[PDB]
Amino acid sequence: NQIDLNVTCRYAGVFHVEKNGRYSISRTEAADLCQAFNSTLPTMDQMKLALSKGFETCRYGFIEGNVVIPRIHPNAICAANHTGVYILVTSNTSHYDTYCFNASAPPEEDCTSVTDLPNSFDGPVTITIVNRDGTRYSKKGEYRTHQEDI
Numbered sequence: 001n002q003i004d005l006n007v008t009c010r011y012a013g014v015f016h017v018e019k020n021g022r023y024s025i026s027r028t029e030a031a032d033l034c035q036a037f038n039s040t041l042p043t044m045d046q047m048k049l050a051l052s053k054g055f056e057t058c059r060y061g062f063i064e065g066n067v068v069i070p071r072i073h074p075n076a077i078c079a080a081n082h083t084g085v086y087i088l089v090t091s092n093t094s095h096y097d098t099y100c101f102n103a104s105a106p107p108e109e110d111c112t113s114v115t116d117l118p119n120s121f122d123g124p125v126t127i128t129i130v131n132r133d134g135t136r137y138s139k140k141g142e143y144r145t146h147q148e149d150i
């Protein structure tokens with residue numbers, strides 16, 4: 001009963017979260033996950049500012065209203081060489097990664113580690129925050145509030 005949450009640097013408060021290293025988060029679970037980080041799904045404007053500060057990924061994730069990939073450098077296999085906040089238009093499927101926005105983060109690039117899930121609630125899941133440098137913080141808890149997600 002274990003969940004790995006892979007987290008990135010924050011850029012103007014925005015970061016990327018991947019559950020168990022594969023696209024596996026519903027829109028409802030994404031909201032709950034950011035909430036556990038005392039964060040919200042970013043708005044498009046928040047994501048655009050994060051991009052301008054140096055945020056890019058190669059993964060689809062939820063923001064408020066859309067599923068996107070922020071791109072700085074054109075790469076053929078990441079949003080098909082697009083740059084900017086690339087918006088997913090056509091897909092059959094409902095599960096992706098998520099982005100989250102923490103208003104308390106630093107204004108620009110913050111590539112320090114994440115060492116807590118400050119707003120998770122009581123629960124039986126071993127939840128592990130995994131940073132890109134491999135540093136880990138684990139706690140027993142839960143964040144999912146929708147039955148269909150568990």
Ligand SMILES: NCCCN1CCc2ccccc2C1
Nearest residue numbers: 006007008021022130131132
């Ligand atoms: N599915 C591709 C995953 C790529 N990510 C990139 C971001 C990241 C952050 C923390 C731990 C692992 C990882 C691996």
